[PDB]
Amino acid sequence: SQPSTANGGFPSVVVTAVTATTSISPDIESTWKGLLAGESGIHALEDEFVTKWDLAVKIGGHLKDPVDSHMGRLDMRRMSYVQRMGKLLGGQLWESAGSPEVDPDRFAVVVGTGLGGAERIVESYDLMNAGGPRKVSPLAVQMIMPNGAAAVIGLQLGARAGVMTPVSAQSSGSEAIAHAWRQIVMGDADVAVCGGVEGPIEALPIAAFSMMRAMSTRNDEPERASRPFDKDRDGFVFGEAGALMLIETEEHAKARGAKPLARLLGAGITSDAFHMVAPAADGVRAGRAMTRSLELAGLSPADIDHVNAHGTATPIGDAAEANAIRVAGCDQAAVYAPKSALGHSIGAVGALESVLTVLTLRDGVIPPTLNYETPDPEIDLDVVAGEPRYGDYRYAVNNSFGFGGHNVALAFGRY
Amino acid sequence: SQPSTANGGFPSVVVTAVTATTSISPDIESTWKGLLAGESGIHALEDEFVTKWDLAVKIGGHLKDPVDSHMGRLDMRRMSYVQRMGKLLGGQLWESAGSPEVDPDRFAVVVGTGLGGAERIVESYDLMNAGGPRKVSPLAVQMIMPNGAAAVIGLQLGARAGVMTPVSAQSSGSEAIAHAWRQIVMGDADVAVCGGVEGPIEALPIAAFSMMRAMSTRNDEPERASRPFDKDRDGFVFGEAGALMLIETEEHAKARGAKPLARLLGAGITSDAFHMVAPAADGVRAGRAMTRSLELAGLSPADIDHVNAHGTATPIGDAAEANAIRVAGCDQAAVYAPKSALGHSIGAVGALESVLTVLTLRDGVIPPTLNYETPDPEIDLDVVAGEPRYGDYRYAVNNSFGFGGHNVALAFGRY
Numbered sequence: 092s093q094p095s096t097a098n099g100g101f102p103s104v105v106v107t108a109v110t111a112t113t114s115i116s117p118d119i120e121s122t123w124k125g126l127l128a129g130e131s132g133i134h135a136l137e138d139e140f141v142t143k144w145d146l147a148v149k150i151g152g153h154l155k156d157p158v159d160s161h162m163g164r165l166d167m168r169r170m171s172y173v174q175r176m177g178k179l180l181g182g183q184l185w186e187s188a189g190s191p192e193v194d195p196d197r198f199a200v201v202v203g204t205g206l207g208g209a210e211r212i213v214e215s216y217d218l219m220n221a222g223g224p225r226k227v228s229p230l231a232v233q234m235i236m237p238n239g240a241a242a243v244i245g246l247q248l249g250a251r252a253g254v255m256t257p258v259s260a261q262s263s264g265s266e267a268i269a270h271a272w273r274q275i276v277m278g279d280a281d282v283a284v285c286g287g288v289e290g291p292i293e294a295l296p297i298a299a300f301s302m303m304r305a306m307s308t309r310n311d312e313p314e315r316a317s318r319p320f321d322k323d324r325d326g327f328v329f330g331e332a333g334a335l336m337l338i339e340t341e342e343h344a345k346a347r348g349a350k351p352l353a354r355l356l357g358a359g360i361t362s363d364a365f366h367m368v369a370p371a372a373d374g375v376r377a378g379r380a381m382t383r384s385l386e387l388a389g390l391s392p393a394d395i396d397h398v399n400a401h402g403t404a405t406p407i408g409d410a411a412e413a414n415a416i417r418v419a420g421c422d423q424a425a426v427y428a429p430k431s432a433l434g435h436s437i438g439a440v441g442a443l444e445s446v447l448t449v450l451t452l453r454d455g456v457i458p459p460t461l462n463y464e465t466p467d468p469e470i471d472l473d474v475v476a477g478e479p480r481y482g483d484y485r486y487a488v489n490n491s492f493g494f495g496g497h498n499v500a501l502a503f504g505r506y
Numbered sequence: 507s508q509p510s511t512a513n514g515g516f517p518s519v520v521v522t523a524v525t526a527t528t529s530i531s532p533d534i535e536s537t538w539k540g541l542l543a544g545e546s547g548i549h550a551l552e553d554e555f556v557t558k559w560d561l562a563v564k565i566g567g568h569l570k571d572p573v574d575s576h577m578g579r580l581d582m583r584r585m586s587y588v589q590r591m592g593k594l595l596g597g598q599l600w601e602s603a604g605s606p607e608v609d610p611d612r613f614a615v616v617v618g619t620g621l622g623g624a625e626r627i628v629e630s631y632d633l634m635n636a637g638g639p640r641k642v643s644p645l646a647v648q649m650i651m652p653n654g655a656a657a658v659i660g661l662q663l664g665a666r667a668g669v670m671t672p673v674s675a676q677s678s679g680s681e682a683i684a685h686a687w688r689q690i691v692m693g694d695a696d697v698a699v700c701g702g703v704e705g706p707i708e709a710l711p712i713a714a715f716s717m718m719r720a721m722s723t724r725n726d727e728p729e730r731a732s733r734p735f736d737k738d739r740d741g742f743v744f745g746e747a748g749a750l751m752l753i754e755t756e757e758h759a760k761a762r763g764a765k766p767l768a769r770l771l772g773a774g775i776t777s778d779a780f781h782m783v784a785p786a787a788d789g790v791r792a793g794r795a796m797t798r799s800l801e802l803a804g805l806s807p808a809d810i811d812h813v814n815a816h817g818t819a820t821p822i823g824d825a826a827e828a829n830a831i832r833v834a835g836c837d838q839a840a841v842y843a844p845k846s847a848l849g850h851s852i853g854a855v856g857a858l859e860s861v862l863t864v865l866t867l868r869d870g871v872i873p874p875t876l877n878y879e880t881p882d883p884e885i886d887l888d889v890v891a892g893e894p895r896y897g898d899y900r901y902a903v904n905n906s907f908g909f910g911g912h913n914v915a916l917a918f919g920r921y
């Protein structure tokens with residue numbers, strides 16, 4: 092019969108450290124306290140690029156503490172932005188873990204991102220148009236390539252059991268943690284740094300998503316604009332983030348005296364084959380990704396206390412995900428939609444929300460979904476709102492979905 | 507007691523169809539015949555961009571049959587180039603396989619690529635710069651995102667068991683087949699379309715790579731420029747390609763009466779943690795990727811008949827790979843380096859070379875490595891050269907490596 096975590100057919104895998112930088116704080120613990128106190132990272136954008144172009148979207152969450160105030164002169168010339176973000180979070184995470192001395196040959200890195208060092212593409216293009224091929228940096232290829240942030244972290248921390256970069260648009264950061272889990276349970280690694288990084292809010296990304304008519308334009312009240320599951324939602328809001336976690340076998344963690352924050356029990360990856368940029372309405376394949384993570388974990392849907400929803404606040408996205416949660420039999424879980432406060436960080440967001448799922452399990456508390464004011468009869472979920480919801484949560488699923496029809500669900504447990 | 511293909515701990519997985527477009531032919535079967543007859547796809551580049559910029563590199567292999575001679579006018583605007591290649595190859599592969607009726611919920615797609623729809627990044631940038639944010643296409647995001655080619659193919663063919671895009675630079679096309687094999691042996695799918703696609707030779711990619719000093723500049727003799735393992739090699743040559751294969755459990759293939767071309771037995775993924783753009787000289791982690799594919803296959807290195815080398819023709823690269831082949835105990839095997847004839851197709855190339863490994867096994871023959879004229883004493887490999895070599899080939903490993911330090915090896919068997 093089928094290997095599961097519960098039946099011992101997969102080894103036990105624990106989360107032993109987390110790190111993130113957000114529009115609320117550069118410190119994940121302070122981001123967590125702010126979320127619980129009802130704080131939002133979303134504000135009026137003050138960038139001159141908003142005025143230069145008169146963008147229809149004038150709201151978003153920049154990082155509280157910009158990555159580049161941490162970067163040396165050479166990093167600014169030799170790395171793309173997602174690489175600098177990767178380096179920053181990778182060193183923070185390692186220090187957080189107690190700087191363990193691990194076997195490099197049993198250590199993997201899996202880090203997702205939406206695009207890569209795309210600013211270096213436009214830089215290279217301009218440099219060559221103005222001055223010819225000899226003006227392109229000899230570092231352009233390694234700064235641009237989308238595996239470049241994962242590679243930087245792997246080099247920095249010494250990972251020799253693989254360095255992988257799954258890209259699946261807005262599920263990339265979750266999918267990275269899924270593949271790290273597979274690398275460990277298939278025997279390829281005992282320890283893995285995983286998660287996601289993403290570029291900052293800029294004019295061209297805004298322009299491109301805005302032309303999809305995907306984004307909230309509630310510019311006069313920025314903190315109220317992101318309303319996942321609310322009746323009056325009008326699209327997503329960008330909120331910058333990067334997040335990594337350290338996962339390892341329980342035996343590896345025990346042998347070095349690490350204190351686990353949670354367990355990572357299983358991962359489901361499916362696809363819709365429905366539309367390139369809208370989720371299937373029926374939620375069936377998305378609900379199957381949740382169900383698969385439960386099969387691998389050895390759990391039933393009634394075990395699931397908590398769902399951390401992808402919850403983008405688009406009208407059709409939230410409706411599809413509500414249907415997916417019912418398909419999976421998880422619609423009596425308490426649901427949190429963290430994009431209500433942190434906005435959408437695209438290739439990083441699944442990793443950020445998996446970190447938040449881990450903290451919910453460690454601490455016994457789910458923050459309030461901001462802006463949740465008018466229940467939507469198509470949604471019919473238990474959306475935590477108003478104040479935090481306390482409980483002894485045993486098991487939780489984190490959802491992420493991505494343009495291309497990608498569905499990723501991760502099942503975590505209390506340690 | 508570790509599961510392996512040979513001990514029945516993983517299900518048997520077979521290759522049932524292959525498709526590729528190359529500098530030699532749009533048709534994989536003709537490419538193969540061309541290879542065996544000693545044909546090269548590498549010529550003088552006739553593009554106006556070469557003289558416009560006076561590029562240092564004036565050679566390479568364009569597709570014999572351009573992807574866009576097959577494309578509708580709408581697709582030329584609303585798909586990126588790699589998406590159009592994916593659509594073309596995906597349709598051709600399915601028709602080659604008999605257009606089988608599979609269970610969509612058991613059908614995955616995994617397709618790697620080096621970058622994605624990056625021409626749409628520069629086009630969006632220019633369009634906005636000239637006319638504002640509302641000139642950017644509403645399709646730009648879904649054309650640009652690096653998962654875009656895999657997602658096009660998943661939607662086209664109806665894959666609902668997962669659509670994945672691993673990015674690991676020059677090893678992406680092999681890594682995709684590795685993850686497709688994992689998706690099947692972990693029980694998430696019974697059938698998968700997998701491989702890699704890549705963009706065409708253009709001015710800015712030539713500038714960026716050639717500023718790395720990686721590329722041959724033997725412009726006076728183009729078919730003699732790509733010289734993997736030859737003492738007088740001087741770097742790689744671009745040769746365009748895309749390649750997909752259909753794999754499925756042997757049970758699945760048997761139930762629908764499909765004739766297997768070969769077996770995909772195991773896949774190893776490791777990393778160097780050495781340098782962003784040079785492979786580790788000792789070949790140790792790269793040899794471990796080969797060993798790991800053998801472990802999962804249940805083979806010993808003494809079983810290996812044939813290695814399809816990554817063999818870029820850089821001085822450093824080929825020397826590191828020969829060390830790797832020694833580390834893995836595979837240096838008694840017959841070695842082919844197809845970039846000698848087909849050049850380097852970056853994100854696609856490990857998929858293309860995986861298809862060539864399958865055909866070697868199917869037909870009992872290895873094509874000659876072109877331009878292999880002076881053995882290099884640091885290499886000391888049995889390089890197939892001169893004429894095709896016929897043989898009873900039973901087991902082969904296809905190697906692929908990438909910037910960032912990624913190592914992928916696939917173990918294939920004769921059906």
Ligand SMILES: CCCCCCCCCCCCCCCC(=O)O[C@H](COC(=O)CCCCCCCC[C@H](C)CCCCCCCC)COP(=O)(O)O
Nearest residue numbers: 172205206209210260290291292296299329330331436651
């Ligand atoms: C909250 C998350 C937001 C996510 C955003 C979307 C993620 C897309 C990737 C983001 C990459 C951008 C990194 C910016 C680095 C930086 O800082 O560059 C500024 C100066 O402007 C620039 O160079 C902007 C150049 C734009 C680069 C091209 C971006 C193309 C975007 C596409 C047209 C639209 C998005 C495609 C996404 C597909 C994948 C996900 C589904 C510093 O200024 P200075 O120091 O020079 O004064």
Ligand SMILES: CCCCCCCCCCCCCCCC(=O)O[C@H](COC(=O)CCCCCCCC[C@H](C)CCCCCCCC)COP(=O)(O)O
Nearest residue numbers: 215236587620621624625675705707711714744745746851
């Ligand atoms: C086998 C070679 C592989 C090389 C490719 C390397 C991977 C990059 C893939 C890029 C895909 C390009 C698709 C070209 C479409 C096409 O054909 O458009 C021409 C007109 O030129 C263009 O717009 C070229 C636009 C440039 C796009 C930006 C490319 C940036 C390249 C980086 C600076 C360097 C490469 C980074 C690779 C990182 C990943 C691999 C390690 C027809 O013009 P028209 O007559 O129809 O008007």
Ligand SMILES: C=C/C(C)=C/[C@@]1(C)SC(=O)C(C)=C1O
Nearest residue numbers: 261368369370408492494496
């Ligand atoms: C297949 C397309 C999908 C899943 C679209 C979703 C719901 S995922 C996401 O982050 C946003 C903004 C969406 O619109």
Ligand SMILES: C=C/C(C)=C/[C@@]1(C)SC(=O)C(C)=C1O
Nearest residue numbers: 676783784785823907908911
């Ligand atoms: C870590 C760096 C590596 C593997 C570099 C290699 C050998 S892989 C490749 O396709 C080319 C052109 C190279 O130079």
Ligand SMILES: [K+]
Nearest residue numbers: 399400401444
């Ligand atoms: K979530």
Ligand SMILES: [K+]
Nearest residue numbers: 814815816859
């Ligand atoms: K090869």
